């Protein structure tokens, strides 16, 4: 629960500075070498905050995976092409499936694209941190509409994942050690526990891995490296970057709108809330 | 690695964090100093954050606290938390200065301190794995928490550029002026430097505090000294996202970007609930949080003196709602489906606004891991009706005449008053442009 | 395995053992670890030589030689001494634990030699290429020791044979990497690029 | 035979090697004129090296203490030490000579007690099979110490020219000079010898002794008889890796030659963190690897005056780290990992550099075989701030016309005040060009 639903938070917070010697790819070595400096630095990580000592953070390891991010050229990522891989070993392994492992490197790295987001947005208010490197806070030459498109902008991230928070925790911890435990006779529990883990994902997003929901998250990504590119470093080109944000979120809406159905995931109702909000103005 | 040198700065500013630090040893239910439970560890599950880990058997504060009187600080020698602070590490024991009253005293003392007063927050972190941050603790009420603390709103962003700014502002009694009668000078002086030296802030009003300490915790004489309770609660209330972990917005930067839309709003409306008493006598059965929220979007908590029809003529824009500790986390989501079909929520009339939830564990500790916690870190556009507050006073103190001449005793020998008048009703107006 | 080999350097012991304590450490056994002495019988005359060359020594030769001398004692320091004490130590602890379990002499012998094999491979990679660059790390501090008993153009014959082994360990770099990348071997001797690093 | 005959010489130097020689037996826990125990030889795993190499069956300390002041002398029988020490060798029955305090009257008392003294350590490093070397344990206060140790430092060094020199220089208080005025001169003749006729230095400012026993003793105030503590305990510390087990470079003549990159740059300092009360109390519940190692990479311990600007504008190019007593020995290269996530010490990168860490089990004692204790030895390129801070005082005080011809009333007639400015000024260069 600690190291990949992250209730120990302090380890998906030390990933944001493992994430702030990123700020996409490539740019970082590429080496054979490289995951054998990297996955050390990765389980000294939840030391890095002085949490505990490795021994029950060596249950935890990793496997960079390469991949073409200058596109043709190699150069590999800590966005999803970094995976936790959870341990085959003699005392757990009656939980401990191929096919759970394939889920769990899933998880680790659907949390961590949605991180980098988040974290490089709060990059953008060290940038703008005032006595004066924030220069003007409104017009003219223009704060004032800018930052207007960028509250709406961190209003919908963090009330998106604010209620994809809550759907991951809840009903899943509730779900799994009570009721196992419970039921007691312990006898093959990886057809239980990869049931458990199919209907873990269910609550995640699921998306049905394919569907427009899947081509927004895709597209409002894509709009977000214009946002820090030209933050760190052009205001017509700044307005344009949330003009077709303001595409993909309009675009939701109508599709929200057909997912209706009677009651059909648990993101449609969370998903009302906001429709509602719509309404209102 | 996301260590905070807390500024503890003033009269009050020593108090509201001599408060805190003691609050933490009590809701860990440890010694100060040893162990003798097991809910240190378990229940704070990152003991060392704003303490460091034990290395003589003691626990050490991240903390500063320089003031104009030397008399604050000698009455936290008194009280017996001498093996929980160092009286020459984490404190000057007997640092003067001013008589003092000016802000014009400390804003002038924090430049000749200027060489050693970045030598004992710089030197308060030197086994710091990296820096979030910077709290100021500091006082507005006198001139001298007020007077060196607004220096330290400028050098610490750009000595530190991407290094946070967050004040503790504490207002002083705005039913009295025989407290201290420069009151609208140093208000306004500081709050010149909350629009543009800064970055978020926290502004807390005085007398909504002792609206508060007659009905909801209901004491008989209402008094200027219920200052520090209420205020060293919502302080440790604030950070249950990094001394216990969270899972998104799992640093303290994150609850506080997504809570200011333009600089010259981010003054935050603060509530905390669990002080009500009749919620106490209905914890065996364990009281409920269906209607806990509605307290959030409804006043019942206010520390922000705001009007009664200025929670309809403006609505939330961003607003938190900060779930704490036991809580039954599993219809967290299912109270907040029932808001939108009443309406008690408030959103602009134009585009999006946002009610974030989002959860978090704490140690052992019965008003807030036995009975619902709720926590508003508000942001409403209502805020300009203090600022009428402040600016009314400030205009209305030169009809009487002082501190037009009795601010010019020392430092300020220019004519500056019209303009903090000037960029004040600037503040104001771009606010009510900001929305239509 | 041929490194360790028999030069002018050969040195080792033969303990004398009895039944029944003959059948814990096997002569066969002792001959697998008298190489691992030897391993740690050349680097400390290499690590002492450097020592006795720095106590026997501004002018034309002399700025240039304690220069040679810095330099060439931090290498054999950082790669000998520091993996052979991140070995002696853990080595010393699994080895108690390997003692006092045992209910058989045929059991601590076989929980000795499947240790044994291990220390070897970490320590030193089969290949006769790891020899070629211990002994041009070595011909330095030979070509010093005799001209400091002897008495400009002495320097850059001492300087060529520098340049000779740091182009060996560059390549000793990548047989480094083109090892497993799976085996722990790889992250003992990434520890000691490390060591070279600062 | 690695005999080493320490030259116990000067008042301030008898006394922080007294309580050297009283610290030695404690640890290897005999009554002071046998061995009583059987400890002697299992624990303490050598026998001689501080010892006269046996012949009657008796271990005899190779220990000269030769001084001008007989009070330095007649204060071993105060004390039950005056049945280890032999009235032949390690003192004379009354010995005389000079007040003397002037550099130059001691050191032409060198050349005419010439007979004696080089034939009372030759008297007692008769029974050795190689001499490992000597140390002069003299000190730069007075002109008793600095004035014959300034002699020694040639003559030892042209008849036996491979023997290792080392010196434990302490220096005389620089913050009083209400009482002597004599300072810059008597401590840069010393200085001068000892960049060209010796090998090595151990560099001990007597304010940066006086700094620690005001932050970690906590006396009213620092004064001689209260700095023999922290100064003799440096030297018993850097004996436990030639006394006790170590493996590679254990001799004296392999830790010392890697803290040398070159003659003129040999500077030590030196740090020893445990004086504390409540850090003494806190190895009985033991504390952890991962921060009693790494303290002695951190700054804050230093025995040297400089600033703190420049242990970050300078970098360590050899480091020298000896933890004591526990140490966890299969977590010293985990600690060694560390080092660069946190940062605390910057490191060479145009050249190799060696970062030094040794453990050592020591003999039953509880003040070192259940305490963590360590000691630094560093080698750091800010040792030039000394360098300034005698030139600045040499340069200051010749202008006021004083020691011009009031210093040379004994053994000087010519010129030399210009050559100890030059020296110096070659000094500081030579280092800070050695290192990019």
Not at chain 1, 267 to 276: G, K, M, P, V
Not at chain 2, 229 to 256: C, E, F, H, K, W
Request: aromatic content about 12%; glycine content about 4%; hydrophobic content about 40%.
């Amino acid at each position: 629960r600690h190291f990949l639903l992250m209730e120990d938070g302090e380890f998906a917070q030390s990933l944001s500075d493992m994430l702030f010697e990123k700020l996409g790819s490539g740019q970082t070595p590429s080496e054979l070498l490289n995951p054998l400096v990297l996955n050390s630095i990765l389980n000294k990580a939840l030391q890095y905050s002085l949490h505990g000592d490795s021994s029950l953070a060596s249950n935890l390891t990793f496997a960079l995976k390469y991949l073409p991010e200058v596109f043709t050229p190699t150069a590999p990522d800590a966005l999803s092409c970094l995976e936790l891989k959870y341990k085959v070993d003699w005392p757990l392994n009656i939980v401990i499936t191929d096919t759970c492992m394939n889920k769990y490197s899933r998880i680790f790295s659907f949390l961590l694209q949605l991180k980098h987001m988040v974290w490089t947005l709060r990059d953008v208010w060290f940038h703008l941190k005032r006595t004066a490197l924030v220069n003007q806070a409104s017009n003219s030459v223009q704060y004032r509409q800018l930052q207007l498109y960028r509250h709406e902008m961190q209003h919908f991230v963090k009330v998106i994942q604010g209620y994809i928070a809550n759907q991951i925790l809840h009903v899943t911890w509730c779900e799994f050690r009570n009721k196992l435990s419970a039921v007691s006779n312990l006898e093959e529990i990886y057809k239980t526990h990869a049931d458990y883990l199919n209907k873990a994902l269910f609550r995640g997003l699921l998306t049905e891995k394919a569907a427009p929901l899947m081509n927004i998250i895709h597209s409002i990504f894509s709009l977000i490296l214009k946002f820090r590119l030209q933050l760190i470093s052009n205001f017509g080109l700044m307005q344009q970057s949330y003009n077709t944000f303001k595409y993909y979120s309009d675009f939701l809406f109508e599709v929200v709108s057909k997912l209706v159905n009677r009651g059909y995931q648990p993101h449609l109702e969370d998903f009302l809330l906001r429709i509602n909000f719509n309404s209102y103005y | 690695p996301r260590e905070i040198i807390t500024l503890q700065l003033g009269q009050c500013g020593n108090q509201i964090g001599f408060e805190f630090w003691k609050q933490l040893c009590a809701e860990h239910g440890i010694s100060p100093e040893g162990i003798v439970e097991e809910f240190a560890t378990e229940g704070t599950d990152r003991k060392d954050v704003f303490f460091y880990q034990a290395d003589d058997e003691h626990y050490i504060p991240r903390a500063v606290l320089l003031d104009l009187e030397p008399r604050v600080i000698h009455s936290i020698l008194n009280s017996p938390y001498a093996n929980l602070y160092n009286p020459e590490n984490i404190y000057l024991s007997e640092h003067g200065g001013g008589a003092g009253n000016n802000w014009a005293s400390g804003f002038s003392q924090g430049e000749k301190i200027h060489e050693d007063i970045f030598d004992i927050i710089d030197r308060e972190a030197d086994g710091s794995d990296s820096l979030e941050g910077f709290v100021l603790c500091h006082s507005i009420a006198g001139g001298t928490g007020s007077g060196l603390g607004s220096y330290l709103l400028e050098r610490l962003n750009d000595r530190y550029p991407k290094k946070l700014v967050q004040t503790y502002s504490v207002f002083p009694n705005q039913d009295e002026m025989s407290h201290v009668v420069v009151q609208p000078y140093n208000s306004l002086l500081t709050l010149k430097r909350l629009t543009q030296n800064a970055d978020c802030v926290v502004v807390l009003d005085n007398t909504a505090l002792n609206r508060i300490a007659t009905d909801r915790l209901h004491i008989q004489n209402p008094s200027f000294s219920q200052i520090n309770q209420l205020v060293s609660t919502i302080m440790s209330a604030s950070t249950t996202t990094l001394r216990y972990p969270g899972y998104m917005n799992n640093d303290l930067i994150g609850l506080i970007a997504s809570l200011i839309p333009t600089p010259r709003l981010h003054f935050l409306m603060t509530g905390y609930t669990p002080l009500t008493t009749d919620q106490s006598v209905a914890s065996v059965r364990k009281t409920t949080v269906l209607d806990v929220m509605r307290r959030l979007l409804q006043p019942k908590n206010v520390m922000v003196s705001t009007g009664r029809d200025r929670q309809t003529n403006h609505c939330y824009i961003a607003i938190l709602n900060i779930i704490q500790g036991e809580v039954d986390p599993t219809q967290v989501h299912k109270s907040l489906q029932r808001i939108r079909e009443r309406k008690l929520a408030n959103f602009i009339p134009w585009g999006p606004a946002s009610i974030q939830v989002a959860l978090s564990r704490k140690s052992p500790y019965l008003p807030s891991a036995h009975r619902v916690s709720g926590l508003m870190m508000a942001n409403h556009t209502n805020i300009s009706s203090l600022f009428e507050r402040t600016c009314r006073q400030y205009d209305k103190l030169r009809k009487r005449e002082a501190f037009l001449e009795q601010f010019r005793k020392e430092d300020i020998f220019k004519d500056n008053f019209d303009e903090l008048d000037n960029s004040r009703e600037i503040v104001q107006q771009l606010i009510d442009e900001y929305h239509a | 395995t041929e490194l360790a080999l028999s030069g002018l350097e050969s040195f080792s012991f033969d303990y004398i053992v009895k039944w029944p304590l003959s059948l814990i450490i096997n002569r066969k056994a002792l001959t697998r670890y008298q190489m691992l002495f030897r391993h740690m019988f050349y680097c400390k005359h290499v690590e002492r030589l450097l020592c006795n060359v720095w106590i026997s020594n501004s002018a034309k030769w002399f700025a240039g030689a304690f220069t040679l001398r810095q330099r060439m004692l931090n290498f054999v320091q950082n790669i000998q001494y520091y993996m052979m004490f991140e070995v002696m130590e853990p080595t010393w602890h699994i080895l108690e634990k390997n003692l006092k379990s045992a209910s058989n002499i045929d059991d601590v012998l076989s929980h000795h030699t499947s240790f044994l094999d291990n220390c070897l491979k970490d320590c030193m990679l089969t290949n006769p290429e790891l020899l070629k660059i211990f002994s041009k790390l070595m011909s330095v501090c030979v070509m010093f020791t005799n001209c400091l008993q002897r008495f400009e153009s002495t320097i850059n014959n001492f300087d060529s044979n520098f340049s000779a082994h740091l182009m060996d360990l560059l390549d000793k770099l990548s047989m480094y990497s083109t090892s497993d990348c799976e085996h722990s071997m790889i992250n003992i001797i990434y520890r000691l690029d490390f060591n070279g690093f600062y």
